[PDB]
Each structure stands twice: as structure tokens, then as C-alpha cells.
Symmetry: D2
Subunit: 113 residues, 4 copies
């Protein structure tokens, strides 16, 4: 394969993951919230910037393992292929971002193992 | 900081638009990044999904891009990915944007 | 600012070394990232990239307590190529200053 | 193909590109200097050096287009290796963001 766009996204599980057994095998999907932060001089702390939302998809053993491990609020690191999609929702054409995950882990920077 | 960086190799898909804003020069263009896969039952590369991005540049990058980029040009773009749902200009309120740090004509193609 | 970000999926290759400094906790460990290619009718190992991974603050504390040799991990951080010339003889090594580390749910 | 480490490096050509006649075909290599900068105006931090390799049309084009000092964007596969950090380049371009 060529010219896939890889992404690594560090964020929080934003929806309860959904597991489905398909003919092609196990599948899991969840929403991931990735919030950029910037250092404020006027407040002397980190302040939230833009939040990117992604729909994260996993398959095979990653799906099976994720289905037992991930819950809303969990800080995670996700690596995978970015897919920018256009679809109709509430009768409007809208662009959205999917990550076809290759690796997912609970982020040790923001929680214990 | 938790910005999502992206490096995208694709083609300029729309004629770039240059705008002089109060904040300085700005350029935007659409970038088409098409994945390809090797076909065994045929010979060559076959096209998969195309990711479309709106690429934004400012300052010197905008000034230089405005004189250099045209539809069809193969380019390499590095920048910050912004998946947007509150766009207040143009005809769509959603976008997948790249706020470009670096852009170059791709010498591979 | 021109930092080079990297995301590496590999295995912990050395026991992490944890140091409690006055400036805060620090940890380092070696990470092995092995490329694989299809076909023997399976995956075969290609080149292994070795990195020294560094972390600080809560990430150092948490990684120290949870990582052991062999563990599959995903690491995101800043790549630093360290080049040390002595007597015209140059020793290069690749460091990752980690922002995020997790046990990889794909392989465990 | 699995678990290759991609990277995108934005830096300056540090050595004149040179030709290598490999068994896999004609190739070009050059040294790339990637210097992080931090705001105080900008001050230089650590410089990462890579050996960048290209083949086929990318090599031919790079050989005719690149010179020492040129700001460039390089995308490719990182190979940490006599030791070195190599990038097997997929895309190289002159960076429109910068001046020599």
C-alpha cells in the first residue's frame, strides 16, 4: 500500500465503545476526543484549545481486547490510519474523521496501568 | 500541547485562494491525498480512498505559495490537523483542515 | 518550532531505570521497533529500530511501575538523534522524549 | 508491510547530494539538519542529523534541485542503524515556508 495517512492521537474515550461481531470478525468503535492545550501567561496554567473528535475503529484481536478494556473518560493513545469522510447527517452534508486503529493503549501519562 | 501533526503527500485539487487579512497574508487550497494498493490479480497500483483536506497557510508560506501552487501540483504538506464543526466562512460549517507549517513541490512526482 | 514527532509501536527491550531527581521523576528504557513483512507463509521480521525512550513527571512514575522487558507498548514523543563526535569517531543513537506511553491492546 | 516508522522532517540540506550506484539502482544521499527552535525571538535548540536516501525519479530530481543550505521537507521511513539515522525518502520538496 502507499500514501496512507498515519496519525497518532492522544485523547479521551468520549463514548461507550460498541462491539459488533461481523462476518468479517470482531469490530469495535468509539468516539475519541483530542484536546489541544496552550500555556497561558495571563493565567499561569494550561488552557484548552480546539477539540478534534474522531471515530476510532478496531478489528480482530485489538477489537476483542478493547471491548473489555475501554470506558468513557479513559485517557488513551491511538495510532492508525486517518480517513476523512463526507456523509449526510440531520439532512446536511458534513465532514468527519475516522481512525482505523492499529494500536491503542491506556495512556500512562494521565493514569495508572 | 497535544496538537495532532500530519504529513500529507497529495495533489493540489483547487486553485489556491490568496486573501490579505488584517492579521496578514493567507492562502487556502484543497488537497487530495489518494491511498493506493497493489493489485495481484491485475498488474499495478489501484486507487483507494481519497482524503480531502483544506490546507491553510499564513505569513511567508502564504506569500510564497500564492506564486507557486496550481491545480494538479504534487505537494508535500506538514501541519496541524483540525477537524472542524464551527466554520463561519464559505458554504460548509464542517472541514478537515491542515494548518500548514511546511509545503513543498514534491520532487518524487 | 520544528520538533520531529514520532509514534512507535514496539517492545520494551531493557528494564526501565527510574531516578527520583530534585527536578522530578525520570525514567529511561530501550524500545525495539521491528518492521514486519508478509511472506514461509506468515509475517517475517525486517529491520529493528532501537530507541532510548525518556519520560518525566507522572508518565515516568507510571511507566516505572508498569513496564517490564518484553511488554508491547505504543510510544508517542519527540525524536532526538544524538551524535557524539570524539577524535573524529561518531557515535549516533536515537532517543524519544515521550509524551504518551501505553501497553498495546493489539498484542496483549 | 507493518510497523515501519514514518517521519516527516523539516530541515536544511547540510551536504551536497551525492550519487550511489546500488545493486537496486541509482540513488542519491544527502545529510539533513533539523534544528528545533524555541521562543525567547527564536533561539536554536538541538539539531538532529539524518542521512536521506532517495532512488529512481526522486533521486534524479533531488540531484538536480538540491544544494547545501536549502530548506526542505522530507517524508520517509526512518531507519536507525557505523551508526546513523537514515531516512528512506518517499517525498522531498523545497520548503516554501522558508529562505536559505
Amino acid at each position: 500500500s502507499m500514501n496512507e495517512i498515519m496519525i497518532c492521537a492522544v485523547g479521551n474515550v468520549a463514548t461507550t465503545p460498541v462491539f459488533r461481531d461481523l462476518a468479517n470478525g470482531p469490530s469495535v468503535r468509539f468516539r475519541l476526543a483530542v484536546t489541544a492545550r496552550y500555556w497561558d501567561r495571563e493565567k499561569n496554567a494550561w488552557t484548552d484549545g480546539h477539540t478534534n473528535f474522531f471515530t476510532v475503529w478496531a478489528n480482530r484481536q485489538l477489537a476483542t481486547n478493547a471491548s473489555g478494556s475501554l470506558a468513557v473518560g479513559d485517557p488513551v493513545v491511538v495510532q492508525g490510519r486517518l480517513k476523512v469522510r463526507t456523509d449526510v447527517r440531520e439532512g446536511q452534508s458534513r465532514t468527519s474523521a475516522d481512525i482505523d486503529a492499529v494500536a491503542i493503549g491506556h495512556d500512562l501519562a494521565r493514569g495508572t496501568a
